[PDB]
Amino acid sequence: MLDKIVIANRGEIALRILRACKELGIKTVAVHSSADRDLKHVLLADETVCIGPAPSVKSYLNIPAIISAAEITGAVAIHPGYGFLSENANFAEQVERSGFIFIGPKAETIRLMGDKVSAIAAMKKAGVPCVPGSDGPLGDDMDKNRAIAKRIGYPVIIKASGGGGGRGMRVVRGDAELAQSISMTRAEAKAAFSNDMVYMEKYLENPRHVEIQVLADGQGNAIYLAERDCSMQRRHQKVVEEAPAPGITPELRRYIGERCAKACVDIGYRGAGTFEFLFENGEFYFIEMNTRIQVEHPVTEMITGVDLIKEQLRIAAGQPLSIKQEEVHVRGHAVECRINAEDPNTFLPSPGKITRFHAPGGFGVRWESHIYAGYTVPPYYDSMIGKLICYGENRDVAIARMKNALQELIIDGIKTNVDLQIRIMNDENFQHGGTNIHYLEKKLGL
Amino acid sequence: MLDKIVIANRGEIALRILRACKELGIKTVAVHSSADRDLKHVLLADETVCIGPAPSVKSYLNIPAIISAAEITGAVAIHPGYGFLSENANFAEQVERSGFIFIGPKAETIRLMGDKVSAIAAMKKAGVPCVPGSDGPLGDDMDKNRAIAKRIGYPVIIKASGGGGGRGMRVVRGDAELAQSISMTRAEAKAAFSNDMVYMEKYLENPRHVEIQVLADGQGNAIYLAERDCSMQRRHQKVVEEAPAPGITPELRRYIGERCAKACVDIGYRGAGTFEFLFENGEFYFIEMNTRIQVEHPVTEMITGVDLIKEQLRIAAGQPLSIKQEEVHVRGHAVECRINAEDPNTFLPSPGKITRFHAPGGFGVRWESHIYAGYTVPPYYDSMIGKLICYGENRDVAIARMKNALQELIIDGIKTNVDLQIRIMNDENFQHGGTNIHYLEKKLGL
Numbered sequence: 036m037l038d039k040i041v042i043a044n045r046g047e048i049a050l051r052i053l054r055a056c057k058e059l060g061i062k063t064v065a066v067h068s069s070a071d072r073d074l075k076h077v078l079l080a081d082e083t084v085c086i087g088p089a090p091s092v093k094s095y096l097n098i099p100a101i102i103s104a105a106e107i108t109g110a111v112a113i114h115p116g117y118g119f120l121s122e123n124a125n126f127a128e129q130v131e132r133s134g135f136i137f138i139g140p141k142a143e144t145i146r147l148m149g150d151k152v153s154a155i156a157a158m159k160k161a162g163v164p165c166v167p168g169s170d171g172p173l174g175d176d177m178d179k180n181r182a183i184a185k186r187i188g189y190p191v192i193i194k195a196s197g198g199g200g201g202r203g204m205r206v207v208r209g210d211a212e213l214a215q216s217i218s219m220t221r222a223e224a225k226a227a228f229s230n231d232m233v234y235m236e237k238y239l240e241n242p243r244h245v246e247i248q249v250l251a252d253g254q255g256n257a258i259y260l261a262e263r264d265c266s267m268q269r270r271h272q273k274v275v276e277e278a279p280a281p282g283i284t285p286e287l288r289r290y291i292g293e294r295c296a297k298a299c300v301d302i303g304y305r306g307a308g309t310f311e312f313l314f315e316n317g318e319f320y321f322i323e324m325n326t327r328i329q330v331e332h333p334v335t336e337m338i339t340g341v342d343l344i345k346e347q348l349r350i351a352a353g354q355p356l357s358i359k360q361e362e363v364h365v366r367g368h369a370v371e372c373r374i375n376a377e378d379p380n381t382f383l384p385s386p387g388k389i390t391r392f393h394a395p396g397g398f399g400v401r402w403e404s405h406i407y408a409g410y411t412v413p414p415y416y417d418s419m420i421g422k423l424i425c426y427g428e429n430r431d432v433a434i435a436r437m438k439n440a441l442q443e444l445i446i447d448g449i450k451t452n453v454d455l456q457i458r459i460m461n462d463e464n465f466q467h468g469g470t471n472i473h474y475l476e477k478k479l480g481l
Numbered sequence: 482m483l484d485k486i487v488i489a490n491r492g493e494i495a496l497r498i499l500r501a502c503k504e505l506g507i508k509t510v511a512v513h514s515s516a517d518r519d520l521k522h523v524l525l526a527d528e529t530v531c532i533g534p535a536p537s538v539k540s541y542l543n544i545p546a547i548i549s550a551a552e553i554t555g556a557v558a559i560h561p562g563y564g565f566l567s568e569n570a571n572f573a574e575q576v577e578r579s580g581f582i583f584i585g586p587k588a589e590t591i592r593l594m595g596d597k598v599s600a601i602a603a604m605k606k607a608g609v610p611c612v613p614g615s616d617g618p619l620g621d622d623m624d625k626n627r628a629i630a631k632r633i634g635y636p637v638i639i640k641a642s643g644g645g646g647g648r649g650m651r652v653v654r655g656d657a658e659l660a661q662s663i664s665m666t667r668a669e670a671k672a673a674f675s676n677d678m679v680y681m682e683k684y685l686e687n688p689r690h691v692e693i694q695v696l697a698d699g700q701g702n703a704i705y706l707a708e709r710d711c712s713m714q715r716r717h718q719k720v721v722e723e724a725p726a727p728g729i730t731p732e733l734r735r736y737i738g739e740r741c742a743k744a745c746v747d748i749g750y751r752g753a754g755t756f757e758f759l760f761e762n763g764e765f766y767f768i769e770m771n772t773r774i775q776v777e778h779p780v781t782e783m784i785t786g787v788d789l790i791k792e793q794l795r796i797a798a799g800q801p802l803s804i805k806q807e808e809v810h811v812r813g814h815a816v817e818c819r820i821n822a823e824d825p826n827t828f829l830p831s832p833g834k835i836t837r838f839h840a841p842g843g844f845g846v847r848w849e850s851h852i853y854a855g856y857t858v859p860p861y862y863d864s865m866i867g868k869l870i871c872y873g874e875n876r877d878v879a880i881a882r883m884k885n886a887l888q889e890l891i892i893d894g895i896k897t898n899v900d901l902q903i904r905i906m907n908d909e910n911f912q913h914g915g916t917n918i919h920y921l922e923k924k925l926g927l
């Protein structure tokens with residue numbers, strides 16, 4: 036087991052990682068910006084280092100300051116959480132070169148899967164179904180670009196290979212728009228990612244966003260831990276996630292899960308990861324892989340009993356997976372509501388002092404948050420302040436508990452999306468299940 | 482002679498140093514991580530000290546623990562091998578300040594040659610031919626940077642002064658890319674080396690990588706021991722090295738060797754060192770100097786009869802070089818194949834337990850490895866598990882012996898590059914000789 040780790044992150048995920056460390060008897064080093072001195076996990080950590088002033092560029096993205104803190108505290112490993120440096124291949128490489136364990140994949144694996152064209156080629160080669168596409172970057176030959184759109188069938192979508200979070204994407208519905216759409220996607224990718232490489236996929240009009248959790252030890256063993264439906268979203272921000280996905284049979288789960296586990300073996304994957312799919316008319320189509328733990332990991336933990344952060348720490352310590360595939364059982368249902376310091380109607384961010392705070396309780400109710408009464412949500416970071424996860428023996432019980440938990444949750448002094456989450460839980464289409472990625476934008480547009 | 486030394490390394494190079502020590506009657510102290518208790522050299526050493534847990538930051542890079550092990554055993558000297566702390570000037574300084582001998586040059590010389598800008602200025606002043614370049618660091622005036630690129634002539638390459646292992650470097654083919662290329666190379670150097678200093682060179686499209694071995698003692702003697710060709714490489718990892726370099730005449734060898742030896746006298750060099758050159762269209766161009774023994778030192782030993790590790794130990798004890806320049810004769814040819822625990826499709830490390838092991842034998846066959854049947858290759862260190870070195874009276878006989886030795890080498894239980902090495906020895910272009918630094922990536926791309 037790792038003697039001591041740096042938690043290279045903040046907010047709810049830093050606290051999540053701290054708890055996993057304490058359960059395993061791992062010493063914690065909380066690195067923080069000067070604005071994050073009062074984070075709950077900093078106040079609970081064995082040691083603390085202030086790594087710079089508020090802005091992330093000076094603190095949480097500051098590679099020399101983080102490595103320096105890990106050196107002076109005698110830590111042996113760094114957990115990057117999600118966001119910040121978690122998919123920064125140069126960071127992973129520097130951590131290993133400075134003689135630390137990186138709690139995540141090999142740097143070369145982060146590079147492979149962070150380049151969307153090379154990632155799709157690897158997945159297609161492994162037997163993972165992908166979206167009908169260019170299967171390679173687009174050139175400047177518009178005869179060949181039109182021939183790819185024709186074979187695929189309009190509508191199509193142009194994506195940046197260095198792209199992500201929905202930025203650097205353009206839908207094309209006929210030939211007249213194709214040349215200008217490719218040119219503009221290139222220019223946007225070059226200006227943002229210093230990488231003008233683009234590819235083409237068939238555009239699916241009304242898919243669900245369904246993702247497969249994996250764990251691999253990097254020693255030849257890989258398992259899948261069912262799927263999450265992340266379709267309830269607004270402007271490429273997930274709002275509700277659930278596990279398992281409604282309408283997914285055991286035979287479908289097994290089909291796509293086995294192809295994801297086999298892909299992990301083929302690419303030498305190490306640690307926690309997520310395969311993202313479009314799911315439409317009963318078919319899965321790979322779009323991209325997250326090479327890190329994700330925000331919504333708790334819904335998978337509730338339905339499998341697997342602690343994904345502890346597994347990340349065991350794998351990083353060099354332990355092979357102890358869990359075999361035949362020991363992974365989907366049981367019951369879990370829903371996660373993201374709690375954001377933003378206006379429930381305008382989504383204007385709402386940093387500020389929380390003047391009153393009460394967390395929900397009950398059977399099947401899990402609260403993941405650093406916030407407390409008197410804590411100031413700072414203006415410098417993300418709006419996501421907490422995650423409310425409710426489990427039941429079925430989806431209806433999970434939703435019933437979430438409605439009750441949302442009604443107990445008090446956060447005064449800032450705006451939150453708690454009232455939006457209550458509306459979503461009361462929505463008849465959500466209660467039926469299986470709504471598509473466009474549903475929440477449509478409901479709010481009315 | 483040195484009574485007792487610490488071997489501040491692991492794996493094959495630790496065993497290589499242990500043998501040199503035993504031949505000279507030097508007592509050995511094997512410092513090891515808790516994962517390396519069963520290394521062959523640890524089991525053969527006179528004394529052992531466990532200096533910390535598996536991760537390199539707390540063991541092989543742990544300066545206090547290594548010096549403390551030298552103090553508690555009564556050792557007089559520390560041999561740093563290659564990698565880890567071998568090029569760490571602060572380490573060399575601390576070793577000398579604590580009153581131990583560092584088996585290497587003066588700390589000041591390590592600092593001079595680790596600053597690529599300062600090293601090039603010293604070599605150019607001494608009469609060593611260098612690449613046409615900025616001859617100084619680039620500032621933030623892009624009018625001056627464009628004028629330097631114009632004077633050199635595109636294509637050019639931007640390099641970190643604190644740089645290493647090909648990381649950060651950017652090729653620039655016109656003015657449009659120059660500003661962003663300089664900015665990105667700086668940011669990468671600052672994040673990795675906390676040193677944002679960069680310089681510019683003419684980019685040579687298809688060079689060979691040719692390096693000159695030197696030895697200098699504290700009595701004023703400096704000699705060259707011919708050259709190695711290190712061109713057969715993939716993503717800045719050497720795969721095959723050979724000595725001498727094919728197509729290098731005795732007149733060229735003498736020309737560049739004499740300039741390297743003279744540079745050693747000018748800068749007060751002491752110990753083993755390597756001058757790295759680009760060789761293209763019959764001309765040498767210095768890029769950088771290694772102030773350490775290197776992985777590929779054995780091919781130079783086979784063609785000269787000189788034991789480079791024993792020379793390192795004699796020099797540090799205050800003895801003159803055991804041979805003069807007129808006594809150094811290139812005789813025959815040697816090839817080295819690096820044996821790696823790596824996956825053939827991902828090229829990631831493939832650590833794990835060796836279940837069956839057989840080393841090759843015969844005339845001209847030299848096997849440099851710590852591995853044995855039942856030995857576990859740990860995940861925490863680099864993938865290179867051995868070196869197979871074959872000597873013949875000519876290049877054809879060296880290659881023939883390597884093909885035979887590769888066919889006898891058994892390493893079961895883990896994936897290895899043995900099959901790749903067999904393919905390289907059967908390659909018609911390699912058999913002809915003189916292939917450039919890009920050849921192996923081109924062969925594998927097909």
Ligand SMILES: NC[C@@H]1CCN(c2nc3nc(N)ncc3cc2-c2c(Cl)cccc2Cl)C1
Binds near residue numbers: 166239268472
């Ligand atoms: N990580 C998901 C990235 C960002 C959004 N995305 C999508 N790609 C797609 N690619 C094809 N060919 N077809 C449909 C897609 C629909 C989306 C999409 C959108 Cl637009 C909004 C919310 C969620 C998703 Cl998954 C790719």
Ligand SMILES: NC[C@@H]1CCN(c2nc3nc(N)ncc3cc2-c2c(Cl)cccc2Cl)C1
Binds near residue numbers: 645689714768
């Ligand atoms: N130790 C050698 C560093 C890393 C590789 N290198 C190179 N520098 C160079 N500098 C100029 N002006 N021109 C060409 C160069 C080509 C290389 C190079 C590369 Cl890219 C791959 C493998 C081997 C070598 Cl030598 C510098």
